[PDB]
Design a binder for these strands. Structure first.
Ligand SMILES: Nc1ncnc2c1ncn2[C@@H]1O[C@H](CSCC[C@H](N)C(=O)O)[C@@H](O)[C@H]1O
Ligand SMILES: Nc1ncnc2c1ncn2[C@@H]1O[C@H](CSCC[C@H](N)C(=O)O)[C@@H](O)[C@H]1O
Ligand SMILES: [Zn+2]
Lengths: 41, 397, 104, 408, 131, 92, 18
RNA sequence: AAUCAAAAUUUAUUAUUUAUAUUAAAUAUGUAUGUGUAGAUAAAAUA
RNA sequence: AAAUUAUAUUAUAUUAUA
């Protein structure tokens, strides 16, 4: 039997790396901003 | 939301706190005689700027005492100078006085009061013992201040099992008492003209030692110079407001939390208007120029813009500086805008128009840097343990 | 199972060896009560660290009086307070925000 | 020899007070408990000691220097909101001697109710300040009062005033200044003239009433037609989107989900301004800090989200226990005109083992399987070795802090 | 303690003296580099960005003779000051500055300008004659 | 689901029978201390009966709790009110 | 799915941008 | 393209740190989880 | 929901408090 969903999400928030998550999310926001800027012209 | 406000405060609290301490340190150095009795905080998500202004202008009325050894607690304001004079007098009594005669008078007075309480006869046979009496009630008020500093909460004297004072329960005659201490210049009389004739007498260092050593005039100088009476904080988002109310209510009492600035709200007048990290957060739909002009319209004294050091932020702050310095030649000279810090020339900023900043992003931002002791969430999120964290800020006073 | 509950006699960093369920808390309950119980700041020694004005005047007494004006100009031109340490009111607000939710 | 009399206003002579909600159920709640029986047993212990030393009696069956005399048996109660002072007077009159009430309020108009309570008896039994109920722990500390009573909402004094807002059947344009004190910002006229459409929906959905399908319809009506110079144009736009207002006005004896959208919007806009979600969440959680061991907490809830907030707090707080929940009797709804859904929540504080009583009823097998995972993975960990975390400990003093109190 | 209160009043008088010259001082805009000499960038109270150098030893305007030591003049001429001072702080105008270069200025602000321009476009842009 | 409410109910029933065994000529210490312990365990029992309401065990002891609270001569109580409503539902 | 959480916080104006 | 001794650079004093080893009481109740810093590198499937 | 990219190994840390 697998784990329930909420303890799995809280454990993924508890034990994962913070710096890699921060860098990937910030570069994802940057890529979305470049897409929006390319759409605006 | 409230989760965004939790993460924003826990991530940026020490950084914004260090930036506000840097800008308020420069403000206390450059303007010593400025005591901001009325403070408006625009965009006060968390009351970090209100807490920093409370620590700068009123170090004694906090719940917890300051770290007295740090450089950040030595400001130029008269209330901060008064509190520093009190702590310096404590250090002079403790360290630079090897005599135990102060402790001798202390335990003599303690044993004498404990013995006259129920054992000895009355104090009328010993003549002219008022010097014990007034220092005893002054030490009693110091004991009440000691209970306030111990419990980290005012109004602790009604909590304990002592009987409350019969008469004035609601506190109306303590607030409606005509004060005999504040005297307007025409209200003085019945005095000799030779005292008001000879001027320039207390210029000697001995008379300055008399004026410093006495403590009766300290409370009389502090009661007229009330540092922070009314504080109004403006915040539209509910999560930021409900966390900033949790932050500010422990040590800054009676903060009115407005939700929006109105165009009719510019008729109320404040001494100090602080916009910390909020001009960049104004949306594109809102006219930021009218907001900046309205924020300048509500200043009797000082308007302080504090923001993170960035390119868009520096463009916002330099445009706001140009918009406010546009309001120079429009009226009375005594209310014209003058920048105290940092730019001393009041022309366009030479770093904003420099040759090198065309192809170099580093030579574009006239900013300053604050250093702080970083917390555990910052060293958790940034993968490096920073014993000293660095916050670059752009400011405008 | 063992270690699924927390006995109130056994400490939280250690693990109890008892298997019973009655009179015990779940670990989310123990986490909430540990976040709840930890509101206090340790008492600061006032006499251990002297004030900054005291040390500044102590350094000014040892200087030559012809060099005191240049030391005053040195102290005035330094607009940096240094490494800004958080006030205990600010630390109390920071931990009050940090104790109201689970660490995860 | 003339007297300078102040000219009165319309609201001063036509001022009405708030009716007493419940008196005998409150006096059993806010007084009675473990802190009351040890109070009454100690008063009888001092009675048999007075006849022992030789004081004059009757035939009958059984800190520091200037504050040497401290008070006797007295039972200290904190009133978070006195209003008209009927609930504050019910503690002191029916309690007789050895009882005290400290009352707080947002408005300065509650000084009138505080003035009449002092004229009956004052100086040592009543004490009044003007502050919110969330700022009670900041000015009284932990373990301060034997009991704390909490009411919420509007009194009948503020509902009838034309200047204090809350007038729905007046047929006149008044400003919609519907707030409980000067400690808040803009009123409802200045709120709805400046709030965005998205900001209003997120604040309406926080209170449970007027859900997302209905709140998006009311916010479509407000922001599209908002030059609002008076409350006459506001109540026209509110009743045009939803149904008309109920016949009782603010007090509707109908069901909550069957209430109209105009009443749901107005009772939530009242909750948006004065921040009753924040003040009740803080005011209950601060009260469990300020209570003594085995003290009493009485909360009155007249709204369904308030019943969710009290139920969510006692199950999570590791000292709070619901002693009993009593609703309003049917006789108070006729003569006074109160809400049928008004309940009284009597919460007590536990000295220890507050979670072992709650684990008797609500302990499922799914919560047991989650509890084993949180011990194995260690998700109950906090923080100790960080910069602000090293300066924080529990309530009991350590050996290194006791030597600091000697010098300081 | 009388020594400390007297020198406290004297530091108050000296601070009141230096506060009158405080609006005429410079602003350290960029962080100073220190290799024997201390070289920094300043906003003057004339609307200029200058690049100034400060030496440790005394070199007068007419001759090198003086009554100061090296420690004396390094406390006078702000060498210890500008060595310990980072950007955003005040520097005195009465201290002599060596080899001051005034930075070139354009009319339009360089803030929020794209660095993805070509090299001759940035060249024409920075010399106040754009294409 | 353990049974500490059962221990509270048995303690109240034992205290009720101890006051029933206080039917001597006059023993003021017995009436005094049994009244004191009954009031103390009543204040400890209020929250536990609030949590254990609508359960399989409380319906067995509701009549005994009502009789013990009626014998101790105190009414217009919250526990007496809850017992009166549950007996009025049980009779209907 | 961290970017889809904030979509409930966007103002109704720019919620329909593309 | 017009200069000059930071730690070019050496030495010392109530004093500022981080480290160096010293360094202890305490069951009346309730209790205390980090990022990193390191050495050679010889297990592996909730997405 | 497979293929496994995954290094993995063990230890330490703070004003206990001077
Ligand atoms: N147009 C506007 N008018 C008023 N406040 C605004 C605003 N736009 C954004 N804000 C608020 O300004 C806040 C900036 S976050 C800065 C928090 C606070 N100044 C501090 O230093 O701690 C945001 O929470 C946002 O809610
Ligand atoms: N959160 C709060 N804190 C303190 N006082 C509050 C408050 N919310 C409302 N009040 C005040 O409480 C009053 C209504 S309380 C209504 C009942 C009243 N307390 C009574 O015992 O009869 C209002 O006048 C309002 O000004
Ligand atoms: Zn500048």
């Amino acid at each position: 039997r697998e784990l329930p969903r909420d303890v799995k999400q809280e454990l993924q928030s508890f034990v994962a790396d913070a710096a890699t998550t921060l860098e990937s999310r910030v570069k994802y926001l940057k890529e979305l901003d470049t897409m929006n800027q390319r759409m605006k012209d | 939301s409230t989760n965004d406000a939790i993460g924003y405060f826990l991530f940026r609290g020490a950084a914004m706190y260090a930036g506000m301490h840097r800008v308020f340190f420069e403000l206390s150095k450059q303007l010593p005689h400025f005591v901001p009795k009325t403070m408006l905080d625009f965009g006060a998500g968390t009351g970090t700027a209100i807490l920093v202004a409370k620590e700068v202008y009123d170090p004694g009325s906090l719940a917890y005492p300051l770290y007295r050894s740090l450089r950040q607690t030595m400001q130029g304001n008269d209330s901060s100078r008064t509190h520093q004079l009190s702590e310096l007098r404590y250090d002079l009594k403790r360290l630079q006085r090897n005599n135990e005669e102060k402790k001798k008078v202390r335990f003599m007075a303690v044993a004498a009061l404990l013995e006259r309480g129920e054992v000895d006869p009355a104090d009328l046979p010993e003549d002219l013992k008022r010097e014990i009496a007034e220092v005893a009630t002054a030490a009693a008020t110091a004991k009440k201040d000691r209970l306030v500093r111990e419990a980290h909460a005012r109004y602790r004297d009604v909590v304990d099992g002592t009987e409350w004072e019969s008469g004035d329960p609601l506190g109306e005659v303590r607030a409606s008492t005509e004060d005999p201490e504040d005297v307007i210049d025409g209200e003085q009389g019945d005095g000799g003209d030779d005292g008001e004739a000879a001027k320039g007498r207390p210029k000697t260092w001995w008379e300055k030692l008399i004026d410093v050593e006495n403590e009766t005039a300290r409370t009389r100088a502090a009661r007229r110079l009330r540092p922070l009476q009314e504080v109004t904080a403006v915040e539209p988002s509910p999560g930021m407001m409900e966390i900033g109310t949790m932050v500010l209510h422990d040590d800054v009492p009676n903060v009115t939390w407005k939700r929006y600035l109105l165009p009719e709200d510019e008729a109320i007048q404040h001494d100090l208007v602080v916009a910390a990290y909020s001009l960049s957060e104004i949306a594109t739909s809102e006219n930021r120029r009218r907001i900046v002009q309205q924020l300048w319209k509500m200043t009797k004294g000082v308007l302080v813009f504090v923001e993170f050091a960035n390119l868009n932020n520096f463009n916002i702050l330099m445009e706001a500086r140009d918009w406010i310095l546009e309001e120079k030649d429009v009226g009375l000279w005594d209310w014209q805008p003058t920048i105290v810090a940092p730019c001393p020339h009041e022309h366009r900023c030479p770093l904003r128009h420099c040759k090198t900043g065309v192809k170099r992003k580093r030579m574009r931002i006239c900013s300053t840097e604050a250093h702080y002791r970083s917390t555990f969430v910052e060293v958790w999120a940034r993968h490096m343990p920073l014993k000293v964290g660095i916050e670059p800020i752009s400011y405008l006073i | 199972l063992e270690g699924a509950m927390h006995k109130p006699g056994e400490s939280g960093l250690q693990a109890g060896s008892s298997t019973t369920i009655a009179g015990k808390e779940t670990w989310s309950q123990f986490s909430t009560k540990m976040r709840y119980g930890r509101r206090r700041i340790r008492v600061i020694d006032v006499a251990a660290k002297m004030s900054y004005e005291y040390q500044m005047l102590r350094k000014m007494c040892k200087r030559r009086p012809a060099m005191r004006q240049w030391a005053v100009r040195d102290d005035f031109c330094d607009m940096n307070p240094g490494v800004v340490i958080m006030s205990p009111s600010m630390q109390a607000a920071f931990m009050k925000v940090f104790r109201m939710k689970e660490k995860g | 020899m003339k007297r300078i009399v102040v000219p009165h206003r319309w609201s001063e002579m036509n001022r009405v007070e708030h009716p007493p909600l419940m008196m005998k159920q409150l006096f059993q709640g806010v007084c009675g408990g473990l802190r009351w029986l040890e109070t009454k047993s100690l008063a009888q212990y001092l009675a048999v000691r007075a006849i022992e030393e030789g004081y004059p009696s009757t035939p009958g069956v059984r800190s520091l220097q200037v504050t040497k005399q401290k008070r006797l048996v007295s039972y200290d109660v904190l009133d978070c909101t006195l209003g008209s002072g009927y609930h504050a007077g019910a503690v002191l009159e029916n309690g007789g001697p050895y009882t005290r009430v400290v009352a707080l309020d947002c408005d300065h108009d509650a000084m009138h109710a505080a003035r009449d309570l002092v004229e009956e008896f004052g100086g040592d039994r009543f004490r009044f300040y003007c502050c919110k109920m969330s700022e009670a722990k900041a000015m009284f500390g932990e373990r301060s009062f034997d009991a704390i009573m909490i009411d919420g909402g509007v009194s009948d004094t503020q509902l009838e005033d034309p200047e204090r807002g809350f007038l729905l059947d007046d047929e006149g344009g008044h400003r919609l200044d519907m707030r409980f004190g000067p400690q808040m910002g803009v009123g409802a006229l200045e709120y709805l003239n400046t709030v965005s459409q998205h900001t209003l929906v997120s604040s309406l959905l926080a209170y449970g009433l007027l859900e997302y399908g209905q709140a998006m319809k009311m916010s479509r009506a407000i922001t599209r037609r908002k030059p609002f110079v008076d409350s006459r144009e506001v109540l026209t736009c509110i009743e045009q989107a939803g149904d008309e207002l109920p016949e009782g006005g603010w007090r509707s004896q109908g069901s909550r989900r069957k209430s109209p959208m105009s009443w749901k919007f107005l009772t939530s806009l009242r909750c948006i301004i004065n921040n009753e979600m924040y003040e009740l969440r803080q005011g209950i959680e601060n009260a469990l800090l300020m209570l003594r061991d085995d003290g009493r907490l009485v909360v009155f809830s007249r709204l369904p989200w308030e019943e969710r907030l009290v139920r969510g707090t006692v199950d999570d707080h590791p000292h709070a226990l619901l002693s009993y929940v009593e609703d309003i009797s049917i006789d108070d709804v006729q003569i006074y005109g109160f809400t049928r859904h008004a309940k009284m929540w009597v919460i007590t504080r536990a000295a220890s083992s507050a979670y072992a009583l709650k684990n008797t009823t609500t302990l499922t097998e799914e919560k047991f399987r989650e509890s084993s995972v949180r011990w194995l993975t260690g998700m109950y960990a906090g923080q100790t070795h960080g910069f602000p975390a090293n300066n924080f400990t529990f309530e009991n003093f350590e050996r290194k802090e006791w030597v600091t109190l000697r010098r300081n | 303690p009388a020594e400390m209160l007297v020198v406290r009043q004297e530091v108050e008088q000296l601070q009141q003296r230096v506060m009158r010259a405080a609006p005429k001082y410079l602003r350290v805009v960029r962080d100073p580099r220190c290799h024997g000499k201390v070289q920094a960038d300043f906003c003057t109270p004339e609307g200029d960005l200058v690049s100034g150098r400060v030496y440790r030893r005394f070199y007068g305007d007419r001759n090198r003779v003086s009554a100061h030591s090296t420690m004396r003049w390094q406390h006078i001429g702000g060498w210890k000051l500008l060595k310990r001072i980072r950007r955003g702080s005040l520097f005195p105008h009465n201290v002599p500055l060596y080899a001051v270069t005034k930075h070139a200025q354009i009319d339009f602000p360089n803030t929020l300008l794209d660095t993805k321009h070509s090299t001759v476009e940035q060249t024409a842009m920075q010399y106040n004659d754009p294409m | 689901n353990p049974g500490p409410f059962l221990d509270g109910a048995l303690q109240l029933i034992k205290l009720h029978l101890a006051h029933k065994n206080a039917a001597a000529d006059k023993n003021t210490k017995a009436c005094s201390d049994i009244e004191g312990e009954f009031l103390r365990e009543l204040e400890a029992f209020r929250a536990c009966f609030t949590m254990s309401s609508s359960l399989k065990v409380a319906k067995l002891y509701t009549k005994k709790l009502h009789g013990a609270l009626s014998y101790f001569q105190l009414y217009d109580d919250p526990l007496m009110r809850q017992l009166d409503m549950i007996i009025g539902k049980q009779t209907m | 799915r961290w970017a889809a959480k904030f979509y409930g916080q966007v103002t109704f104006g720019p919620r329909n941008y593309p």
